[PDB]
Design a protein around this ligand. Structure first.
Ligand SMILES: [Mg+2]
Ligand SMILES: [Mg+2]
Ligand SMILES: [Mg+2]
Ligand SMILES: [Mg+2]
Ligand SMILES: [Mg+2]
Ligand SMILES: [Mg+2]
Ligand SMILES: [Mg+2]
Ligand SMILES: [Mg+2]
Ligand SMILES: [Mg+2]
Ligand SMILES: [Mg+2]
Ligand SMILES: [Mg+2]
Ligand SMILES: [Mg+2]
Ligand SMILES: [Mg+2]
Ligand SMILES: [Mg+2]
Ligand SMILES: [Mg+2]
Ligand SMILES: [Mg+2]
Ligand SMILES: [Mg+2]
Ligand SMILES: [Mg+2]
Ligand SMILES: [Mg+2]
Lengths: 322, 376, 111, 158, 46, 109, 217
RNA sequence: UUAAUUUAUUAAUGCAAACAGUAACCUGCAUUAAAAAUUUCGGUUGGGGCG
RNA sequence: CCUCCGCAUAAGCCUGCGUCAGAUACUGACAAUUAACAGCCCAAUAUCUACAAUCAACCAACAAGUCAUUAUUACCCUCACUGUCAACCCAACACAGGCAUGCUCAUAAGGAAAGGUUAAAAAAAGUAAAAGGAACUCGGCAAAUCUUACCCCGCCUGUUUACCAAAAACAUCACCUCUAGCAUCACCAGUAUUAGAGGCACCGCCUUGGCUCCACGAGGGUUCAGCUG
RNA sequence: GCUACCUAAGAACAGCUAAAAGAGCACACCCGUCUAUGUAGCAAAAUAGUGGGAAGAUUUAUAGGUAGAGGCGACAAACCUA
RNA sequence: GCUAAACCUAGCCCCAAACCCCCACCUUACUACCAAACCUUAGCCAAACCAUUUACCAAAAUAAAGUAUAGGCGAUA
């Protein structure tokens, strides 16, 4: 029995809880014709495409923002492959699952025939990023292994099902987006969009100001941890033979309009109790505040466009292995 | 012999009481009570119609009383119809002449494979958490990565930054043939569209040669045989884009099939017919968007390509529409079928024989690369 | 309100208002160490999440960020002196997660 | 539905027997209603109609249980109401012929308040009666303002 | 073999076979309910 | 096989458990994804007055006087409402266009 | 029982219909026919038996092109999917009609006996005397109910002023009206009767179980 | 069952009964069949049976 | 030191070893299973769908097969409700029995055959046994070591008397004979190469058959060899 | 809700040999040949070893249908809630 | 001297008189909201078997009278 951890989650303070489940310290910050094509694809998927069945706002996310990111990422890869030869041999998956299964800590069985026994408490992330870009050569590291980070990872005092998180028993899958015998096994950029349930319009219909930032951060921590951990376990490290080189990836999480960018570095797979009693390292996730790409659409133009957001997508697609 | 067995059909409502026969006295019914009683003759309730209308319980009006009703029998070729005669019924419907070979222009444009083995393996071997990915899973992955390979060959050919691919665009086009009014509806595949119209591929000499050339007949099969006999249809023609759309000219139509069930898949000839009708629909919709709606012979022909489904077996098509004068001179279609990159893929070892493709060939991928690169 | 026939809504009728609510909830001490900003409530069976959220928003001016509910089965296992079963009732429990980090903590009544 | 002895001999088997009548689909004109009815008659009805000198006379003369049909008594109260109201039965331009009809059957004339209740079952009679006395309630605003107006007119008189 | 357990429970079979709706469908089942009601039974059906 | 215990939503196969439910009133309707559409008008709105600056409070004093019972009969309400008829010497004829209809009740509590 | 018969379909569809087995049982739920039950699961191809059924707002004698001869699990012959005009349908295929032949459906009574091929269908006035025919109808227009099983061919023995005489394959004679339509030639799946069933398993796949107590007496 | 009694029920005839005429289905009464249906199967006996 | 065990879902139960207090897993009190998993679906009128599956690719069939929408009309209001515990269910029992599916292949999970002695008989189970090797016995039953052939019956694989009979009986391909010329609630959406009923027993040769006749059997007997309390 | 048969939509069948066969050996499962224990039993038919089938005329979950001189039956007067 | 034993009213029986009874709930009842009733009782039982027959039951004081009457003319009615 393992907790199904959901990256795209409705729960409150899931960033803090996933920091606990994952052993990440979260640090805010970071470690032309492109504007024409971004505006073109954006206006194509909102206005310029003709619609027979008229589009509702329950389906607007998966009919609008999903092909928008699909074509935007594909064309940005196509137009940045001259500037960077890493995106020539890269593999580009559209909605391919990224599972990672890890054990983190222990519990005492509360009741039953097995009452009072030690049970390692398992988790599994089952994720489908919108689209991701994978390399055959490892990216940079942003930071040497075992950094200082005097920020003190949270210390969750309840059971992990008070954040509504639920146990199930199903197949234990560790999956980078492609199988193990695939040369393009490392990854460097991953693009998520938040679903219809997680509209920040709905969260402001509900009762917050910063829990939009919390859902962006939770998706970041869980998705990137699963993807870098799956890369590590593919390279042969596991919770006993911990990683030697730090693993790394990058993710932008959007909701169609708002974007935010994250960089993740995995230093530990030693998460279990016996492998974590004397483990000073911790994984590190760097995050940006959410920022809007465009403001509104008046059927032939995008009013307030954001060069900062477009250039950050470019930079994330633009680094490369050494 | 009439189908529709009596026991399954609705029985006759029971005979009324004879107080309804006797004139003139009003029967005493259980309408004053608000329930059935088995004495007290059953009333005849008036036909109740909801005065307003709920969205959730709509009963669509009968097909006579619709706003746009056309008395002539119409036909629609939407994405599902599978033609009997296939390619020759397609040719008769669209008034074209067929060419067995791809043109020397795109062959000269023909005149890396590590990544091609990577795409074949990534589609049919490596992409899913279990073994043996299905056709719904591997076929769009193949065509998507081949489009990505061309958008990587951007470096050698720098004018591919003027063409974007569209995911869910519909379209429509209508014409006459006898006269009898036909129609084609939109795809669901990829529509690679560019900002600059495609070059004319055959000259006026070949145009007049096809004018001399005649069509074929396939009696007693009428040429409408698997066309959906459609009622009210909104005859207005449509390239599925609002006006002023950048990248307007449809370069290539990528038609793909999911549904790994063989009875659900298209046959090769029916798939070539689908490509021919869809290329003609897109080309004619572009022709009536640019020029007038009149029936004439175009001085500037339009060219639209198409690529077929079923990632193992490929079909390529180039369609030159030079006439919208239907009911003379004929359009041209250079097709080729069953290119068959990766003859077969053994996914599990057999007991000897390793995992992976068998019967591989790259000249078909060369044809794909050319057929992408024809515009620039 | 409970044990009241609700007026049917057809398509574009008025909103259902309630004056003089029939719903009486009570704030309970959690049994199993729920977090900060989780209040626990015991609630009538006919009261939804949306009803409890609007109850607490309007009557008490508590900003509610999430409501979760469950139905607790009470034991039917006790027996009388007649060997006939005694049913402890079934109730509904809600878990209210506060907004803006308001962080309720159950006071120590009965010092 | 009875028993019978096997060979018309009581010292023999006794054994069930059902004697049914013979049934015809005959078409009848009734001069009072002016309609052609097709009904399932038997020779006894046909003979009773012949000795009654017509279907109209048979149904108006025969008693409730000698007629013994819910339909037959529906026909009776339709005919009786036709007579009791003296309706424009065929149409105008023949009022002398209508007078001939109602004069031919003038003897079986009863009040309308009786002919409406002729022939009903008890279930129909109770249903008809409660339909008569439904009477959607009178608002007590109306009742009390009537009382108050009466009292104020009494005070104005006094 | 060992023949103790002919009762293999399922609430769908229980409700469909002996339920109130089925009792009330048949006119003999209506009399079954009427008999339990007269006997005074606390449970008239499944 | 308890006939005597109550039948609830905890007490059947998976379909039975999904269909029964406690007595909570519906709040919307279910369509075509098994997706649920909540209708705002079907959701009841609590109408709560502003109680600030108020003197009525949840008990009275024992120094309050005793007064005998008089239920509000329609005649008493009538006389208290139309003494202006006596002055001369309001009523609803039907209730189709009325929001809070009296007899086939439109309102809650 | 709650026996709605599965054959509720009204429109003539060409697609197979999911066919429900019966177990040899009435609507009452009890066994009526013994020895039935548990075959391979099959699907019913809706055969049009009116061989001369001209399509909507059309004329007399017309042509059809055979598309596909096919095994039918629900009978003993082979079914030909044929196409003519704007519609296509299943018919019982006579022997030696491959995929590609062309067949003729004529209601015309030519005075001379038409020199016709083996596949097509005409009324018995156009058929000659002593002629091998299979799909035979009693009254004109009802549709063929006689010889249409696998390999059977009834002969036309003589033509009379308003009628004709058919030797049905039971060595029988039947008077038919002159104007009714019949297909010439013998039906496909000849050699079918010389198929040894082999195993009791093969019988149980065909859908016939061993059944005892066949006389509820 | 080739024992007694019955065909009430089904069936196929016949006779009437209810239609069309021109110089089939329903009902009543008989019959022979089928399925049945009811009912019984004495006594003495050097155990009971056989005789 | 043990275990076809264990964990999960389904079905079934319905709070049934959680805390505290009390009396002699009992009694009472207090707690608890939180939706993302699962269930509770679908606005229709007309209409479209000949192509199996089996790595589906050659290739192979017969017993002929489950997965599929379109033109238009109306439809943006959005995430409620319910299941969620346990040592559990059906067998009167804390019953050596019954119990579907996924996963682990000896377990990372789960468990304990001995209350304490003594060491009689009889009884149960096991292991070992000189010499001999079926002399036992109805019979090599049981054990021990593995094998040969002949007959009888039934052609075969199958089925059967739940709880004393598993067979030579029943069924079965094959064959014969009898009845039936036809449409819509079985047979049948069938048509004499079809359907219904009965009987015999495969097969090669010949016309109540007969003679051969191969394979199979927890059937019924017989022989040799070994092996053994 | 057992059991007999049927209907509807499901599922299971290791390995080796073999190469679509009511195939061979043999697990899972289904059955119940022989013996031994047991007999108020663990059990109103079980246990232990031995055995037979185990890709099919197979087994099996869920829902439904046939009802008492009736059903149902690969006939055993078998089964239809010990 | 243990186990016990003892108890009297909880009620009941037969008559007379008088004619009696907010919500949810036929879908899987106890679930807010969607396109049809009407047809002879049979048999055990007596006849010492059983085969016509065999009390009453399907409102009717006392007597007429167990009479007229019926009936394998017999049991019986
Ligand atoms: Mg004697
Ligand atoms: Mg027991
Ligand atoms: Mg352990
Ligand atoms: Mg001891
Ligand atoms: Mg020895
Ligand atoms: Mg001896
Ligand atoms: Mg001896
Ligand atoms: Mg032995
Ligand atoms: Mg045998
Ligand atoms: Mg036995
Ligand atoms: Mg058995
Ligand atoms: Mg046995
Ligand atoms: Mg055997
Ligand atoms: Mg086998
Ligand atoms: Mg034996
Ligand atoms: Mg059987
Ligand atoms: Mg026998
Ligand atoms: Mg016997
Ligand atoms: Mg007697």
């Amino acid at each position: 029995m393992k907790y199904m951890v959901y990256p795209q989650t409705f729960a409150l303070n899931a960033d803090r809880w996933y920091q606990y489940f994952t052993k990440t310290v979260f640090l805010s910050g970071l470690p032309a014709a492109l504007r024409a094509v971004a505006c073109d694809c954006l206006l194509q998927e909102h206005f310029y495409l003709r619609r027979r069945r008229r589009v509702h706002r329950y389906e607007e996310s998966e009919v609008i923002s999903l092909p928008f990111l699909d074509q935007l990422v594909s064309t940005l890869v196509g137009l940045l492959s001259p500037h960077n030869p890493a995106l020539a041999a890269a593999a580009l998956d559209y909605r391919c699952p990224v599972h990672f299964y890890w054990v983190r800590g222990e519990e005492i069985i509360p009741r039953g025939h097995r009452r009072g026994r030690i049970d390692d408490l398992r988790y599994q992330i089952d994720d489908k990023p919108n689209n991701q870009i994978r390399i055959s050569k490892q990216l940079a590291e942003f930071v040497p292994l075992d950094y200082s980070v005097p920020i003190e990872i949270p210390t969750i005092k309840c059971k992990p099902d008070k954040l509504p998180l639920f146990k199930r028993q199903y197949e234990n899958h560790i999956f980078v987006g492609s199988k193990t015998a695939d040369p393009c096994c490392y990854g460097h950029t991953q693009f998520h969009l938040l679903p219809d349930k997680l509209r920040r319009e709905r969260l402001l219909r509900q009762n917050c100001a910063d829990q939009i930032e919390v859902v962006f951060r939770a998706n970041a921590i869980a998705s990137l941890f699963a993807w870098t951990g799956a890369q590590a376990m593919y390279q042969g490290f596991w919770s006993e033979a911990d990683v030697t080189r730090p693993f790394v990836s990058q993710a932008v999480i959007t909701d169609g309009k708002y974007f935010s960018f994250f960089c993740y570095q995995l230093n530990t797979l030693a998460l279990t109790t016996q492998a974590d009693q004397n483990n000073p390292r911790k994984n590190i996730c760097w995050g940006t505040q959410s920022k809007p790409l465009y403001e509104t659409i008046e059927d032939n133009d995008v009013k307030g466009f954001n060069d900062d957001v477009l250039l950050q997508i470019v930079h994330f697609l633009l680094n490369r292995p050494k | 012999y009439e189908w529709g067995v009596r026991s399954t059909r609705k029985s006759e409502p029971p005979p009324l009481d004879r107080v309804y026969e006797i004139p003139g006295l009003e029967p005493i019914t259980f309408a004053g009570k608000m329930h059935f009683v088995p004495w007290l003759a059953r009333p005849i309730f008036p036909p109740w119609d909801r005065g307003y209308k709920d969205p959730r319980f709509y009963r669509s009006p009968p097909l006579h009383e619709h706003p746009l009703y056309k008395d002539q029998a119409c036909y629609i070729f939407h994405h599902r119809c599978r033609l009997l005669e296939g390619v020759k019924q397609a040719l008769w419907l669209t008034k074209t002449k067929l060419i067995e070979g791809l043109p020397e222009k795109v062959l000269s444009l023909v005149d890396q494979d590590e990544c091609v083995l990577n795409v074949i393996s990534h589609a049919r071997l490596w992409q899913t958490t279990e073994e043996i990915p299905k056709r719904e899973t591997y076929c769009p992955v193949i065509v998507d990565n081949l489009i990505q390979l061309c958008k990587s060959q951007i470096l050698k050919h720098p004018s591919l930054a003027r063409r974007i691919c569209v995911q869910n665009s519909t379209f429509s086009a209508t014409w006459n043939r006898e006269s009898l009014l036909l129609q084609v509806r939109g795809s669901g595949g990829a529509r690679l569209s560019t900002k600059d119209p495609l070059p004319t591929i055959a000259s006026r000499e070949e145009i007049e040669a096809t004018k001399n050339h005649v069509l074929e007949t396939f009696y007693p099969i009428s040429p409408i045989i698997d066309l959906h006999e459609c009622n009210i249809y909104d005859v207005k023609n449509d390239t599925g884009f609002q006006e002023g759309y950048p990248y307007p000219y449809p370069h290539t139509l990528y038609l793909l099939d999911k549904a790994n069930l063989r009875p659900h898949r298209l046959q090769p000839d029916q798939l070539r017919a689908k490509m021919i009708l869809f290329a003609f629909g897109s080309a004619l919709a572009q022709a009536r968007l640019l020029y007038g709606n009149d029936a004439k012979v175009l001085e500037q022909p339009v060219v639209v390509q198409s690529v077929g489904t079923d990632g193992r077996v490929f079909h390529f098509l180039v369609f030159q529409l030079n006439t919208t004068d239907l009911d003379g001179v004929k359009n041209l279609a250079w097709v080729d079928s069953d290119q068959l990159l990766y003859q077969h893929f053994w996914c599990l070892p057999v007991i000897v024989e390793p995992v992976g493709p068998v019967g591989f060939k790259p000249e078909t991928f060369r044809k794909f690369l050319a057929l992408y690169l024809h515009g620039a | 309100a409970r044990n009241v026939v609700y007026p049917l809504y057809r398509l574009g009728g008025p909103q259902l208002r309630v004056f003089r609510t029939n719903f009486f909830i009570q704030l309970v001490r959690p049994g199993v160490a729920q977090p900060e900003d989780t209040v626990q409530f015991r609630i009538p069976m006919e009261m939804t999440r949306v009803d409890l959220r609007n109850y607490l928003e309007g009557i008490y001016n508590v900003p509610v960020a999430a409501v979760r509910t469950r139905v607790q089965h009470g034991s039917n296992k006790r027996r009388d002196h007649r060997n006939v079963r005694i049913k402890k009732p079934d109730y509904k429990v809600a878990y209210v997660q506060l907004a803006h980090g308001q962080t309720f903590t159950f006071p120590d009544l009965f010092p | 539905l009875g028993q019978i002895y096997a060979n018309n001999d009581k010292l023999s088997k006794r054994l069930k027997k059902v004697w049914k009548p013979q049934l015809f689909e005959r078409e009848f004109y009734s001069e009072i209603l002016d309609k052609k009815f097709t009904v399932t008659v038997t020779m006894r009805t046909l003979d009773l109609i012949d000795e009654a000198y017509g279907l109209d006379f048979y149904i108006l003369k025969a008693s409730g249980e000698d007629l013994c049909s819910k339909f037959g008594m529906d026909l009776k109260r339709g005919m009786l109401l036709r007579l009791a109201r003296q309706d424009p039965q065929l149409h105008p331009e023949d009022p002398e012929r209508r007078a001939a009809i109602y004069d031919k059957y003038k003897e079986f004339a009863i009040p309308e308040e009786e002919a409406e209740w002729v022939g009903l079952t008890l279930e129909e009679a109770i249903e008809k009666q409660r339909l008569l006395e439904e009477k959607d309630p009178v608002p007590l605003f109306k009742i009390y303002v009537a009382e108050l107006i009466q009292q104020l007119q009494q005070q104005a008189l006094s | 073999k060992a023949r103790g357990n002919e009762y293999q429970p399922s609430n769908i079979k229980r409700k469909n076979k002996h339920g109130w709706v089925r009792r009330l469908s048949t006119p003999a089942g209506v009399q079954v309910i009427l008999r339990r009601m007269l006997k005074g039974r606390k449970s008239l059906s499944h | 096989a308890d006939r005597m215990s109550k039948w609830t939503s905890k007490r059947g196969p998976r379909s039975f458990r999904g269909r029964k439910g406690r007595g909570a009133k519906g709040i919307g309707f279910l369509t075509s994804g098994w997706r649920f559409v909540q209708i705002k008008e079907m959701v009841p709105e609590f109408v709560v007055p502003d109680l600030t600056g108020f003197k009525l409070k949840p008990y009275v004093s024992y120094l309050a006087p005793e007064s005998e019972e008089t239920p509000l009969t329609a005649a008493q309400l009538f006389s208290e409402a139309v003494a202006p008829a006596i002055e001369k010497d309001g009523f609803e004829p039907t209730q189709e266009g009325k929001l809070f209809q009296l007899y086939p009740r439109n309102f809650l509590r | 029982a709650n026996f709605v018969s599965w054959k509720s379909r009204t429109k003539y569809t060409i697609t197979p219909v999911k066919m429900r087995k019966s177990g040899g049982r009435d609507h009452t739920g009890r066994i009526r026919v013994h020895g039935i039950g548990g075959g391979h699961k099959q699907r019913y191809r809706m055969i049009d038996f009116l061989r001369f059924r001209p399509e909507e707002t059309k004329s007399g004698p017309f042509e059809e092109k055979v598309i596909q001869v096919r095994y039918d699990p629900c009978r003993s012959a082979d079914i030909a999917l044929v196409a003519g005009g704007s519609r296509k349908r299943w018919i019982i295929a006579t022997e030696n009609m491959q995929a590609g032949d062309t067949i003729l459906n004529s209601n015309h009574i030519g005075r001379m006996a038409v020199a016709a091929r083996e596949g097509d269908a005409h009324p018995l006035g156009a058929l000659p005397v002593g002629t091998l025919i299979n799909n035979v109808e009693s009254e004109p227009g009802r549709g063929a109910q006689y010889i249409r099983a696998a390999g059977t061919c009834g002969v036309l023995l003589r033509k009379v002023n308003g009628t004709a005489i058919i030797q049905l394959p039971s060595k029988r004679q039947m008077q038919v009206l002159e104007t009714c339509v019949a297909t010439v030639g013998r039906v496909s799946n000849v050699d079918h009767n010389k198929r040894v069933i082999g195993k009791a398993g093969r019988n149980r796949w065909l859908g016939k179980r061993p059944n005892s107590g066949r006389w509820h007496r």
